Amino acid sequence: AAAKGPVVVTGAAGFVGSWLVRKLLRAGYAVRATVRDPANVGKTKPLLDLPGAAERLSIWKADLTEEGSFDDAIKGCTGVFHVATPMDFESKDPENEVIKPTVEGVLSIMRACKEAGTVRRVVFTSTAGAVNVEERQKPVYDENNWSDVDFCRRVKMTGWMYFVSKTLADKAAIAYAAEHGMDLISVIPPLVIGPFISAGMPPSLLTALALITGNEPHYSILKQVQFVHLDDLCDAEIFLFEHPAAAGRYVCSSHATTIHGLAAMLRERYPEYRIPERFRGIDDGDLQPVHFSSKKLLDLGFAFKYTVEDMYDAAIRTCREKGLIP
Ligand SMILES: NC(=O)c1ccc[n+]([C@@H]2O[C@H](COP(=O)([O-])OP(=O)(O)OC[C@H]3O[C@@H](n4cnc5c(N)ncnc54)[C@H](OP(=O)(O)O)[C@@H]3O)[C@@H](O)[C@H]2O)c1
Ligand SMILES: O=C1c2c(O)cc(O)cc2O[C@H](c2ccc(O)c(O)c2)[C@H]1O
Numbered sequence: 001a002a003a004k005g006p007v008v009v010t011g012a013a014g015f016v017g018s019w020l021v022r023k024l025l026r027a028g029y030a031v032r033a034t035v036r037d038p039a040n041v042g043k044t045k046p047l048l049d050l051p052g053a054a055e056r057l058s059i060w061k062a063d064l065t066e067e068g069s070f071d072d073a074i075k076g077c078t079g080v081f082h083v084a085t086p087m088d089f090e091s092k093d094p095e096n097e098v099i100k101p102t103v104e105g106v107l108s109i110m111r112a113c114k115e116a117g118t119v120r121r122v123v124f125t126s127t128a129g130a131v132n133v134e135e136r137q138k139p140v141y142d143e144n145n146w147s148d149v150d151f152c153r154r155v156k157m158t159g160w161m162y163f164v165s166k167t168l169a170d171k172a173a174i175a176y177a178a179e180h181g182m183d184l185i186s187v188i189p190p191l192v193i194g195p196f197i198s199a200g201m202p203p204s205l206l207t208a209l210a211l212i213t214g215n216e217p218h219y220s221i222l223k224q225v226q227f228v229h230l231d232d233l234c235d236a237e238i239f240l241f242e243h244p245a246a247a248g249r250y251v252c253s254s255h256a257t258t259i260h261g262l263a264a265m266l267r268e269r270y271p272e273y274r275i276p277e278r279f280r281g282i283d284d285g286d287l288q289p290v291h292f293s294s295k296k297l298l299d300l301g302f303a304f305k306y307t308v309e310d311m312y313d314a315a316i317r318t319c320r321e322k323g324l325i326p
Pocket of ligand 1: 011012013014015016017035036037043062063064065082083084085086087125126127128166188189190191192193202204
């Protein structure tokens with residue numbers, strides 16, 4: 001058969017984007033992978049080495065801060081997977097340097113998609129930080145819950161600008177799509193764990209593996225955390241792109257637990273690494289999982305393939321090669 005319609009993946013050199021490019025290639029797609037510097041071979045080479053990239057992968061230069069930088073890559077495509085997002089959070093002007101750029105970059109992508117005229121559906125990768133960041137945590141969250149931007153700007157917890165960046169970018173994309181009759185899917189992943197192709201530790205694996213290492217500043221994140229295997233997320237993003245009935249936001253979380261429960265699992269399953277018994281900055285006593293419901297996606301027929309055990313087994317190995325002690 002022929003390639004299943006040219007699709008674009010923004011941020012293809014990244015943790016999520018590189019794997020989605022892989023999975024889209026395996027699924028029979030012609031993939032137009034976007035990067036800020038097609039010349040940085042350290043970042044681009046792992047993509048070109050992917051199975052099937054020689055025939056159906058092409059690399060394009062684009063930057064969310066440069067208007068029109070994406071028009072060429074999008075022209076003639078049937079779909080666009082927006083995965084790139086500004087990841088700088090050591091800013092002194094978070095607003096004009098992280099927030100507005102994130103919101104203006106997604107809207108420019110949406111504008112490019114509408115003007116291309118060939119795109120049938122846009123898949124925006126959101127984050128759980130656009131759902132459950134509020135003063136009083138609920139026991140269950142789904143695609144109808146939205147983070148409280150005002151509360152984020154008020155208390156300015158660690159990582160506040162990213163949550164607000166992504167929550168506004170999510171709302172912006174949805175509004176633009178509704179105003180212009182565009183078909184937009186919004187996929188909400190929690191902390192993503194899985195293999196990686198870069199030679200640098202993905203940030204989400206720093207958090208996921210903070211209990212084996214000693215990354216105590218990451219303990220607060222694991223307090224009440226949800227996970228998804230990177231492979232399941234990328235599969236779900238392809239599933240949602242191909243299902244004609246999909247529409248709107250989708251939660252893509254397959255596991256919810258607490259720091260205590262995770263430490264328990266790692267103790268029993270990895271006697272080799274020493275797991276702390278008391279975690280700095282947590283202490284206290286009663287923590288109950290906060291669940292992210294994926295019922296909308298599962299109802300459409302999607303099924304998760306991997307367990308949290310599968311996630312760490314794969315994260316360990318790809319890091320045991322380099323980046324972590326054995
Ligand atoms: N990993 C998780 O746990 C998780 C959970 C929920 C949602 N997400 C979302 O998944 C998506 C991918 O994130 P990630 O985990 O894979 O982190 P990542 O590896 O840092 O990927 C981010 C990508 O965005 C690109 N990027 C940054 N600024 C850009 C710009 N101005 N123009 C074009 N590209 C730019 C980066 O390319 P450069 O190499 O050139 O900087 C980078 O490849 C994000 O939208 C994230 O919010 C991730
Ligand atoms: O994007 C996300 C993210 C990320 O990209 C990088 C990183 O290092 C940690 C992260 O954690 C976020 C998160 C997970 C579970 C939640 O309950 C929540 O509110 C937020 C996640 O959404």
